[PDB]
Write an enzyme that holds these catalytic residues in place. Structure first.
Site, PDB file in Angstrom:
ATOM      1  N   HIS A  74      27.648  28.888  16.261  1.00 38.76           N
ATOM      2  CA  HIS A  74      27.938  27.484  16.523  1.00 38.76           C
ATOM      3  C   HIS A  74      27.627  27.205  17.996  1.00 38.76           C
ATOM      4  O   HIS A  74      27.969  28.018  18.847  1.00 38.76           O
ATOM      5  CB  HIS A  74      29.446  27.221  16.240  1.00 38.76           C
ATOM      6  CG  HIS A  74      29.874  27.657  14.869  1.00 38.76           C
ATOM      7  ND1 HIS A  74      29.824  26.819  13.784  1.00 38.76           N
ATOM      8  CD2 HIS A  74      30.300  28.852  14.382  1.00 38.76           C
ATOM      9  CE1 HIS A  74      30.195  27.476  12.690  1.00 38.76           C
ATOM     10  NE2 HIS A  74      30.507  28.713  13.024  1.00 38.76           N
TER      11      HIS A  74
ATOM     12  N   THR B 240      35.327  28.041   8.658  1.00 41.18           N
ATOM     13  CA  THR B 240      35.281  26.860   9.532  1.00 41.18           C
ATOM     14  C   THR B 240      34.262  25.845   9.065  1.00 41.18           C
ATOM     15  O   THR B 240      34.072  24.826   9.742  1.00 41.18           O
ATOM     16  CB  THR B 240      35.007  27.177  10.997  1.00 41.18           C
ATOM     17  OG1 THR B 240      33.667  27.639  11.132  1.00 41.18           O
ATOM     18  CG2 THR B 240      36.001  28.168  11.536  1.00 41.18           C
ATOM     19  N   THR B 241      33.606  26.114   7.937  1.00 37.65           N
ATOM     20  CA  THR B 241      32.788  25.173   7.199  1.00 37.65           C
ATOM     21  C   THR B 241      33.304  25.081   5.767  1.00 37.65           C
ATOM     22  O   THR B 241      33.939  26.006   5.240  1.00 37.65           O
ATOM     23  CB  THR B 241      31.322  25.619   7.137  1.00 37.65           C
ATOM     24  OG1 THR B 241      31.253  26.925   6.562  1.00 37.65           O
ATOM     25  CG2 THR B 241      30.703  25.624   8.502  1.00 37.65           C
TER      26      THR B 241
HETATM   27  O1  LIG Z   1      32.164  29.622  10.115  1.00 33.90           O
HETATM   28  N1  LIG Z   1      33.181  30.202  10.051  1.00 33.90           N
HETATM   29  O2  LIG Z   1      33.810  30.749   8.995  1.00 33.90           O
HETATM   30 CU   LIG Z   2      31.047  30.319  11.799  1.00 35.06          CU
END
Ligand SMILES: O=N[O-]
Ligand SMILES: [Cu+2]
Ligand SMILES: [Cu+2]
Length: 259
Positions: free
Chosen positions: A95, A197-198
Protein backbone atom coordinates in the site's frame (compact mmCIF):
# COMPACT_ATOMS: atom_id res chain seq x y z
CA UNK A 1 -14.61 -4.57 -10.40
CA UNK A 2 -15.63 -0.80 -9.62
CA UNK A 3 -17.69 -1.56 -6.34
CA UNK A 4 -14.71 -0.93 -4.04
CA UNK A 5 -11.42 0.89 -4.49
CA UNK A 6 -9.59 4.01 -3.27
CA UNK A 7 -11.21 6.72 -5.35
CA UNK A 8 -13.36 9.70 -4.36
CA UNK A 9 -16.47 7.54 -4.61
CA UNK A 10 -15.56 3.96 -3.72
CA UNK A 11 -12.86 4.38 -1.11
CA UNK A 12 -12.57 3.07 2.41
CA UNK A 13 -15.34 5.22 3.85
CA UNK A 14 -17.74 3.38 1.50
CA UNK A 15 -16.75 -0.27 1.98
CA UNK A 16 -19.10 -0.99 4.90
CA UNK A 17 -22.06 -0.93 2.51
CA UNK A 18 -21.09 -4.16 0.75
CA UNK A 19 -18.94 -5.50 3.61
CA UNK A 20 -20.62 -4.66 6.92
CA UNK A 21 -17.79 -6.30 8.81
CA UNK A 22 -15.88 -3.08 7.93
CA UNK A 23 -17.38 -1.68 11.17
CA UNK A 24 -16.59 -4.84 13.10
CA UNK A 25 -14.85 -5.48 16.35
CA UNK A 26 -11.42 -6.54 15.09
CA UNK A 27 -10.80 -4.34 11.92
CA UNK A 28 -7.44 -3.33 10.52
CA UNK A 29 -5.30 -1.25 10.20
CA UNK A 30 -4.98 0.60 13.51
CA UNK A 31 -2.81 3.35 15.00
CA UNK A 32 -0.15 1.83 17.16
CA UNK A 33 0.12 4.04 20.28
CA UNK A 34 3.62 3.13 21.35
CA UNK A 35 3.05 4.37 24.90
CA UNK A 36 -0.05 2.15 25.36
CA UNK A 37 1.12 -1.07 23.70
CA UNK A 38 2.24 -3.46 26.42
CA UNK A 39 5.34 -5.55 26.31
CA UNK A 40 4.40 -9.24 26.58
CA UNK A 41 7.39 -11.38 27.69
CA UNK A 42 5.37 -14.48 26.76
CA UNK A 43 5.65 -13.59 23.06
CA UNK A 44 8.07 -15.76 21.27
CA UNK A 45 10.54 -14.55 18.46
CA UNK A 46 8.92 -14.64 15.08
CA UNK A 47 10.05 -17.54 12.86
CA UNK A 48 10.20 -16.49 9.21
CA UNK A 49 11.13 -19.58 7.17
CA UNK A 50 11.27 -18.33 3.57
CA UNK A 51 14.30 -20.29 2.32
CA UNK A 52 12.30 -22.63 0.03
CA UNK A 53 9.82 -19.99 -1.16
CA UNK A 54 8.60 -20.51 -4.71
CA UNK A 55 7.29 -17.26 -6.21
CA UNK A 56 5.28 -17.88 -9.33
CA UNK A 57 3.72 -14.75 -10.74
CA UNK A 58 3.08 -11.04 -10.19
CA UNK A 59 -0.43 -9.83 -10.88
CA UNK A 60 -1.89 -6.30 -11.07
CA UNK A 61 -5.25 -7.11 -9.52
CA UNK A 62 -6.54 -3.55 -9.87
CA UNK A 63 -5.95 -2.47 -6.27
CA UNK A 64 -2.33 -3.40 -5.78
CA UNK A 65 0.02 -5.92 -7.25
CA UNK A 66 0.40 -9.38 -5.69
CA UNK A 67 3.51 -11.47 -5.86
CA UNK A 68 2.13 -15.07 -5.58
CA UNK A 69 3.78 -18.22 -4.18
CA UNK A 70 3.29 -22.00 -4.45
CA UNK A 71 1.47 -22.94 -1.23
CA UNK A 72 0.73 -26.67 -1.93
CA UNK A 73 3.55 -27.68 0.44
CA UNK A 74 5.28 -26.11 3.45
CA UNK A 75 7.81 -24.02 1.49
CA UNK A 76 7.61 -20.46 2.87
CA UNK A 77 6.09 -20.45 6.33
CA UNK A 78 5.62 -18.18 9.31
CA UNK A 79 5.59 -19.72 12.79
CA UNK A 80 6.26 -18.65 16.34
CA UNK A 81 5.64 -15.17 17.63
CA UNK A 82 1.99 -15.08 18.66
CA UNK A 83 1.07 -18.01 16.40
CA UNK A 84 0.10 -21.64 17.05
CA UNK A 85 0.96 -23.96 14.21
CA UNK A 86 2.25 -23.32 10.73
CA UNK A 87 1.17 -20.61 8.30
CA UNK A 88 2.08 -20.81 4.65
CA UNK A 89 2.95 -17.77 2.54
CA UNK A 90 0.54 -17.33 -0.32
CA UNK A 91 1.30 -13.74 -1.57
CA UNK A 92 2.64 -10.29 -0.70
CA UNK A 93 1.60 -6.79 -1.79
CA UNK A 94 2.03 -3.10 -0.82
CA UNK A 95 0.00 0.00 0.00
CA UNK A 96 1.47 3.47 -0.87
CA UNK A 97 0.78 7.20 -1.21
CA UNK A 98 0.81 9.98 -3.79
CA UNK A 99 3.27 11.96 -1.64
CA UNK A 100 5.97 10.83 0.74
CA UNK A 101 4.00 12.07 3.76
CA UNK A 102 1.36 9.30 3.48
CA UNK A 103 0.77 5.73 2.23
CA UNK A 104 0.97 3.30 5.13
CA UNK A 105 -2.11 1.60 6.60
CA UNK A 106 -0.90 1.18 10.14
CA UNK A 107 0.42 4.37 11.78
CA UNK A 108 2.77 4.82 14.72
CA UNK A 109 1.84 7.56 17.18
CA UNK A 110 -0.11 8.99 14.24
CA UNK A 111 2.91 9.02 11.96
CA UNK A 112 2.18 7.86 8.44
CA UNK A 113 4.92 6.23 6.45
CA UNK A 114 5.28 6.52 2.69
CA UNK A 115 4.13 2.87 2.16
CA UNK A 116 3.49 -0.52 3.82
CA UNK A 117 4.22 -4.11 2.76
CA UNK A 118 1.96 -7.07 3.67
CA UNK A 119 3.09 -10.70 3.54
CA UNK A 120 0.02 -12.96 3.74
CA UNK A 121 0.06 -16.48 5.21
CA UNK A 122 -2.61 -19.17 5.98
CA UNK A 123 -2.90 -21.79 8.74
CA UNK A 124 -2.25 -25.28 7.41
CA UNK A 125 -4.66 -26.99 9.83
CA UNK A 126 -7.43 -25.68 7.57
CA UNK A 127 -6.12 -27.22 4.37
CA UNK A 128 -6.46 -24.27 1.95
CA UNK A 129 -6.56 -20.45 2.00
CA UNK A 130 -10.26 -20.36 1.27
CA UNK A 131 -11.04 -22.48 4.32
CA UNK A 132 -8.52 -20.57 6.45
CA UNK A 133 -10.05 -17.14 5.91
CA UNK A 134 -13.21 -18.55 7.53
CA UNK A 135 -11.40 -19.11 10.82
CA UNK A 136 -10.44 -16.57 13.53
CA UNK A 137 -6.91 -17.90 13.47
CA UNK A 138 -6.83 -18.60 9.76
CA UNK A 139 -4.26 -16.04 8.57
CA UNK A 140 -1.11 -14.31 9.75
CA UNK A 141 -0.02 -11.07 8.00
CA UNK A 142 3.40 -9.60 8.47
CA UNK A 143 3.38 -5.81 7.96
CA UNK A 144 6.46 -3.68 7.24
CA UNK A 145 6.62 0.14 6.90
CA UNK A 146 8.48 1.97 4.07
CA UNK A 147 10.12 5.43 4.36
CA UNK A 148 11.79 7.42 1.57
CA UNK A 149 15.54 7.75 1.78
CA UNK A 150 18.05 5.27 0.42
CA UNK A 151 16.96 2.66 -2.14
CA UNK A 152 15.99 -0.90 -1.10
CA UNK A 153 17.97 -3.32 -3.31
CA UNK A 154 15.68 -6.31 -2.73
CA UNK A 155 12.76 -4.30 -4.05
CA UNK A 156 14.26 -3.36 -7.40
CA UNK A 157 13.26 -6.63 -9.15
CA UNK A 158 9.68 -5.82 -8.21
CA UNK A 159 10.06 -2.19 -9.40
CA UNK A 160 11.47 -3.14 -12.76
CA UNK A 161 8.66 -5.62 -13.68
CA UNK A 162 5.96 -3.07 -12.94
CA UNK A 163 6.08 -1.66 -16.47
CA UNK A 164 4.86 -5.07 -17.66
CA UNK A 165 1.85 -5.17 -15.34
CA UNK A 166 0.92 -1.52 -15.64
CA UNK A 167 -2.79 -2.23 -15.82
CA UNK A 168 -5.35 -4.37 -14.08
CA UNK A 169 -5.43 -8.09 -14.91
CA UNK A 170 -1.95 -8.18 -16.30
CA UNK A 171 0.28 -10.84 -14.88
CA UNK A 172 3.86 -11.72 -15.52
CA UNK A 173 5.93 -14.71 -14.64
CA UNK A 174 7.80 -13.82 -11.48
CA UNK A 175 9.79 -16.84 -10.46
CA UNK A 176 12.68 -17.00 -8.08
CA UNK A 177 11.91 -13.84 -6.11
CA UNK A 178 13.24 -13.92 -2.56
CA UNK A 179 10.95 -12.19 -0.06
CA UNK A 180 13.69 -12.11 2.57
CA UNK A 181 15.08 -9.08 0.68
CA UNK A 182 12.16 -6.99 1.88
CA UNK A 183 12.66 -7.45 5.61
CA UNK A 184 14.25 -4.86 7.94
CA UNK A 185 17.04 -5.84 10.29
CA UNK A 186 14.93 -6.23 13.43
CA UNK A 187 11.90 -8.55 13.77
CA UNK A 188 10.64 -6.67 16.83
CA UNK A 189 6.93 -6.39 16.39
CA UNK A 190 3.59 -5.35 17.64
CA UNK A 191 0.76 -7.89 17.34
CA UNK A 192 -2.97 -7.73 17.62
CA UNK A 193 -5.96 -9.64 16.24
CA UNK A 194 -7.50 -8.02 13.19
CA UNK A 195 -8.70 -8.37 9.68
CA UNK A 196 -7.94 -8.21 6.02
CA UNK A 197 -7.57 -4.51 5.05
CA UNK A 198 -9.39 -4.96 1.73
CA UNK A 199 -12.81 -6.51 1.11
CA UNK A 200 -14.00 -8.98 2.26
CA UNK A 201 -12.34 -7.58 5.44
CA UNK A 202 -12.63 -10.98 7.12
CA UNK A 203 -11.60 -11.09 10.78
CA UNK A 204 -9.24 -13.95 10.37
CA UNK A 205 -5.83 -12.26 10.79
CA UNK A 206 -3.21 -12.31 13.46
CA UNK A 207 -1.34 -9.05 12.59
CA UNK A 208 2.36 -8.87 13.15
CA UNK A 209 3.69 -5.32 12.45
CA UNK A 210 7.41 -4.72 12.52
CA UNK A 211 8.74 -1.69 14.42
CA UNK A 212 11.61 -0.98 12.04
CA UNK A 213 10.70 0.52 8.64
CA UNK A 214 12.58 -0.30 5.48
CA UNK A 215 13.96 2.58 3.36
CA UNK A 216 13.23 2.89 -0.35
CA UNK A 217 14.32 5.61 -2.71
CA UNK A 218 12.28 8.42 -4.18
CA UNK A 219 12.78 6.81 -7.57
CA UNK A 220 11.47 3.40 -6.37
CA UNK A 221 8.30 4.80 -4.91
CA UNK A 222 7.89 7.00 -7.99
CA UNK A 223 7.68 3.78 -10.04
CA UNK A 224 4.96 2.36 -7.80
CA UNK A 225 3.10 5.61 -8.50
CA UNK A 226 3.18 4.96 -12.26
CA UNK A 227 1.03 1.83 -11.98
CA UNK A 228 -2.59 2.05 -12.98
CA UNK A 229 -5.72 0.94 -11.22
CA UNK A 230 -7.45 0.71 -14.62
CA UNK A 231 -7.25 -1.98 -17.25
CA UNK A 232 -5.55 -1.50 -20.60
CA UNK A 233 -7.46 0.75 -22.95
CA UNK A 234 -9.19 2.66 -20.15
CA UNK A 235 -8.69 6.16 -18.72
CA UNK A 236 -5.43 6.33 -16.81
CA UNK A 237 -5.86 6.48 -13.05
CA UNK A 238 -2.57 6.29 -11.22
CA UNK A 239 -2.40 3.54 -8.59
CA UNK A 240 -1.62 5.82 -5.62
CA UNK A 241 -3.09 6.17 -2.14
CA UNK A 242 -4.28 2.51 -2.06
CA UNK A 243 -4.31 2.48 1.76
CA UNK A 244 -7.13 2.10 4.27
CA UNK A 245 -6.79 4.56 7.20
CA UNK A 246 -6.54 3.52 10.83
CA UNK A 247 -9.65 1.87 12.32
CA UNK A 248 -10.89 1.88 15.92
CA UNK A 249 -8.95 -0.38 18.26
CA UNK A 250 -12.07 -1.26 20.29
CA UNK A 251 -11.59 -4.13 22.75
CA UNK A 252 -8.11 -5.04 21.68
CA UNK A 253 -4.73 -4.74 23.22
CA UNK A 254 -1.66 -4.29 21.02
CA UNK A 255 1.15 -6.34 22.48
CA UNK A 256 4.78 -5.50 21.88
CA UNK A 257 7.45 -8.12 21.56
CA UNK A 258 10.01 -5.58 22.83
CA UNK A 259 10.77 -3.19 25.69
O1 LIG B 1 -4.29 -6.05 2.92
N1 LIG B 1 -4.29 -6.51 4.00
O2 LIG B 1 -4.85 -7.64 4.47
CU1 LIG C 1 -2.32 -5.35 2.45
CU1 LIG D 1 -16.14 -3.65 -8.08
Amino acid sequence: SHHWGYGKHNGPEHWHKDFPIAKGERQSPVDIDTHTAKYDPSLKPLSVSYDQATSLRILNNGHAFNVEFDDSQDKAVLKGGPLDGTYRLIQFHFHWGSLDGQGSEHTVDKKKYAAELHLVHWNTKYGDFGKAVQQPDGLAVLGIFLKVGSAKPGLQKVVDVLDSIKTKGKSADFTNFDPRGLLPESLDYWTYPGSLTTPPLLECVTWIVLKEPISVSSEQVLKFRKLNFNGEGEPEELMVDNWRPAQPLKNRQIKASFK
